[PDB]
Symmetry: D2
Subunit: 313 residues, 4 copies
């Protein structure tokens, strides 16, 4: 019947084991904030993640941890509001840089505070050059980290759970391939592993970015989601206005409710069911002097009261 959904179900228990392992190690969601990726790093390095600094080893030393997906960028980001209070903090600890390729760890580099000074100087000298102005997310090149860092290998310092991660790895690999077959680049970012569940359940195909998804018949949709244990309102648009609304009003919306890494429920609302929001938002736009609205929310209770449940109990 549905071979891709069958595959998910058959891979699921191991996704759940991987989630369990991430939780044990201080990572709340594998399918969000590089959760499934950070776990590899923590297990290889022997590090304890901090919920100030990002991690601590068993000797009590603390670290800054930065990471990139080489498939997308070559610069490690830093701090959006770069100041000398930030910089003096930075000079106190070694840094761990992680280089992922897709969902896989490709390299880990350690830099001591002296190997980074070149950036602390050019950052605080140009803070003053421009007079008391905070820098916006300045980059440290991967090339620089590779040149001055000491690369870290799996070793005697790695956590015993590294072998449990290794045993799970092949199923995670295949799950990621499944996501990619369905247009999701990374199961461990942007709720990728959850979204895949939504697409397999609904039969929706994502639209490369227009609207978010399309069914077999050619009908298109806006597709929104929340982690219900974290929030009770669905996001819409950071620059809400009449133009965004005229696009929205032409399609049904799909609303996915995740709890943990699992899909709890899916609802569908037709354009007529959202007219209350379009109207609310247009008047607000005008009332404020033709001013864009910053991500106004649709409450899950509204969605549950007016929508049709396509999945859940």
């Amino acid at each position: 019947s549905h071979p891709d959904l069958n595959k998910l179900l058959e891979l699921w228990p191991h996704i759940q084991e991987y989630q369990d392992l991430a939780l044990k190690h201080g990572i709340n969601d594998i399918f969000q904030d590089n959760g499934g990726k950070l776990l590899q790093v923590l297990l290889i390095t022997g590090l304890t993640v901090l919920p100030g600094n990002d991690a601590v080893d068993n000797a009590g030393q603390e670290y800054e941890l930065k990471s990139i997906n080489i498939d997308l960028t070559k610069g490690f980001s830093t701090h959006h509001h770069m100041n000398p209070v930030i910089i003096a903090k930075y000079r106190q600890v070694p840094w761990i840089f992680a280089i992922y390729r897709g969902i896989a760890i490709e390299a880990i580099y350690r830099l001591e505070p002296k190997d980074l000074e070149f950036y602390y100087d050019k950052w605080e000298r140009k803070w003053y050059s421009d007079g008391h102005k905070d820098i916006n997310n300045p980059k440290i090149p991967v090339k620089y980290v590779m040149e001055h860092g000491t690369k870290i290998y799996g070793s005697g310092g790695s956590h015993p759970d590294l072998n449990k991660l290794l045993e799970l790895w092949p199923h995670i690999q295949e799950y990621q391939d499944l996501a990619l077959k369905h247009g999701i680049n990374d199961i461990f970012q942007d709720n990728g592993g959850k979204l895949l569940q939504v697409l397999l359940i609904t039969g929706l195909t994502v639209l490369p970015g227009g609207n978010d998804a399309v069914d077999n018949a050619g009908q298109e949709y806006e597709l929104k989601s929340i982690n219900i244990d974290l929030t009770k309102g669905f996001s819409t648009h950071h620059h809400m206005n009449p133009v965004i609304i005229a696009k929205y009003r032409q399609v049904p919306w799909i609303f996915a409710i995740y709890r943990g890494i699992a899909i709890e429920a899916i609802y569908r609302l037709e354009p007529k069911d959202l007219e209350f929001y379009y109207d609310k938002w247009e008047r607000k736009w005008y009332s404020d002097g033709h001013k864009d609205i910053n991500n106004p929310k649709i409450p899950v209770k509204y969605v549950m009261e007016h929508g049709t449940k396509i999945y859940g109990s």
Copy 2:
């Protein structure tokens, strides 16, 4: 979209809790031997299943517990090989009769030692006269239990767990409806609950000759085992060269169960089973034209030569 498989996925956490609930009450498998049914009678009556007497209450009285499905029969099966020695055990305990309709308990009756005296003594007369022979599966009628029995209702004597049961019931009902739609009569019998997972995964539907059919009209034999219990799939209790000739025409689907969940599905084509067909078909002739009593297909043969459909 596959809306029936989706339905099972949404129902599953509840099916699991039901199963968890039954194992807490001494029931290993809700989907075999009326487990999901008996769970209702234990919770209604406040009874606990015993590991020769069937059940016990918190006050010590020990009971014999029989049951039937009204949809299919009117008689309460008793014992295949009963003697007049048995009847003295049968006689020191009130019996508890459960009458189910489909998956739901319809009525519960408690008859006392005094009320079965008509039947023991009819079978004790049966043994003597016919010539010291065993009465195969006698049947107490429902009308006899209804008439002489004391009906049991939900009450203060019911297990507090009955509340959890009632909250899970809507889901069990909906799961049962899904079964029915796919040609399975009873989730709580013959691995009914598991077979459905099989059908929704394979895209098969049970046939009212061959066991199942897909959308294209193609038909299949379908065998299953509970791996903790058996290692070889079964075939036919009276296998004859004509049964084999039907076997040869269709692919087989083999389901491996582990508890209430489907662990693996394998498909074999007619050529992968030729070795067995040929061996049984000849053996029949050799032994002297006599039917073969359920020869087995090893699970390892299926894993070695089949194509895995789910695992």
Copy 3:
């Protein structure tokens, strides 16, 4: 404060893991019916236990399984009601004999139906010699099994869970030592691993067999237990009479309620709280013509209604 109770708590999670592993493998209670011992055997041999025959291998062959604790006996028991319907059953399958030393597996022997024929013959020839009489639990000597059997070693046929059992083994070992320090010979027979919990909780010392246990002050007790999920009545005595009652009536009774391998609750009833039973049982003895009663029960509900809870919620 209480170092032996502290030890239990510290060993417990692993007793629970061992229990989990036994359950996964078809053994309901590690602390009963050689549960923790049978598990070793199943894992070494690669066998699936049957709830007819005792076990099955992955090829479908079935077996009879017998076992002894060498510390106690040298004969494998068989069938209390030995008949030719029993014997012809026996001739159909190989037998696995297990030889334990305490809680540890010491040897495993396999015998084919021809290696046992000597016993099938001397059993059915003496069935008839005595005319249609069923034999009572005839013995096969360990010496005979060792001579004609083929000894089984850990091998490529063993279950992967054997290594998980090995990892747990040292904590099971120490738990057994703890039981022995408290007068319990075997944690895997006669609810030994549960009883140890009761003794650590109550501070009771068992009395070698008089009464069952004694406290520090010198007060003695009858000590009864049940697995509540299996039964609702406490056992008393297989040959109940006025003599057994006069002994009982002089001490308080301790009543342990196990659920699974854990202690759910402990109650205490004074002699005055059991007088209803003594009286009930004496009259019954006389009423029946001075006839011993076969294990009459005290209901757990009675115990809960009239006793003092020393442990539980």
Copy 4:
């Protein structure tokens, strides 16, 4: 017999469910930062904790959430380094005040944006006049919240989970009483709930100078860490040669926590810590007669040189 440790063992499965219940509601540790308390206010109010606004309801309104323990104080701590820029965030949201007494919620009040205007503007006047300086931890009085606030009661707006909470409460109460008896004021603060497991295992009782004492009169320092958070035990925020001289006289007990459960207990004698005493005591003199701000004892030092009491 050890009747207090027994009591903890009987209570434990319930303490665990409570903790399971709090983590389901976004609370990581019931025994730290009033977790077991906040759980009550979230369930009472139907609120969900947010990962700058403290909480949200199912309808989207977002709130700021403050609280106090009436037993210890009358003022609602506000912010250590508040500016007049903050106050614009502070001003678009109704606040929710929780007043606890010991471990129980005594009253909940909801003040609206309009009702805090007296205080923002008093602090906005505080910043200007004194000379552009930060007001450390101002305090809104309880009388001010009681008087101008709208009290919140259990209702239809409460989480269905509140029912589970109420059924666990008798056990949490009894556990709290056990804590109190052993010198711990609050199970839901400062690892209160975990420290008790420590005391019952070691046979120690908290002192009203030294941290704890056994039956013999012997006293101990007692340090603990949550291993997922810290790897070095702490000492004294203003360590002086006289603090060290008290340290030298007693053995130390070191507790390693993992979630709500005690993972290990180690004891060190005064000779195993000499190395640290000597190094801090000198360092003090070297640096120029200045107090040491909480030097740490590594967990590995404790495991290498201590005697393990529980693990």
